[PDB]
Ligand binder design. Sequence first.
Ligand code: 5JM
Length: 238
Amino acid sequence: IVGGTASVRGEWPWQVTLHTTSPTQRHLCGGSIIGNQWILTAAHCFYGVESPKILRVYSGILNQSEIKEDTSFFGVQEIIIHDQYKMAESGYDIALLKLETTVGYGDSQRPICLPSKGDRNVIYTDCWVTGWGYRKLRDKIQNTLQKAKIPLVTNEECQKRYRGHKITHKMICAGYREGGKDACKGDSGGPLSCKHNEVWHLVGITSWGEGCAQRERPGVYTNVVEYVDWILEKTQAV
Ligand SMILES: O=C(/C=C/c1cc(Cl)ccc1-n1cnnn1)N[C@@H](Cc1ccccc1)C(=O)Nc1ccc(C(=O)O)cc1
């Protein structure tokens, strides 16, 4: 996160750190708890991940230093990538992790509501992007979970900013015209959380951008409301 500040413990209890153990254990991506055995994240996080066996989901974490060999984690039973996904820049950058065990909900870890289908016509004015990603293009994974308040940008405005790309209505952009606050390397997969009527909603999944926090280059996010049917298809299968 560029231009953000340290989160407070328990502030984003749906936020998870997805680690890989191959070849060495390190933070791979962010994710969000959406159900008691479900993490919503970005499909591009799994480029070259050949097995769910190398993945570890840690919830209730503020600091990466809380993670040692004796720290409890959730094993991943299955990786579900949207079958239309080709690359982040083309959309469908969404994946679900089915966990091997159930997350016990508490003040440190709980789910975030998915947006409502009717709420596709609501203006979100209180949106935050969180993660352990870089604070600048050449940096490193941050110890403390960072947060940044970012305004949503219309599809028309985002399309003007990305000449040569196709910004679809299955994408949602966020950023200041002058830059300064954005997601960066390591934040992918994490949430873009918006508060509406005192309830937080998972509006976006951090996906891609041209560099980090540049003037007139909004961050591009998977527009979660456009995937509610797909999430239910996958999590509510009979
Ligand atoms: O986190 C981001 C999002 C970028 C982005 C999103 C918006 Cl919304 C705006 C601007 C953006 N950026 C544009 N350029 N950078 N970020 N991208 C991932 C892609 C990836 C995923 C998994 C494995 C390998 C690659 C990344 O780099 N992840 C990554 C990089 C370094 C390290 C490590 O451990 O060092 C660990 C993880």
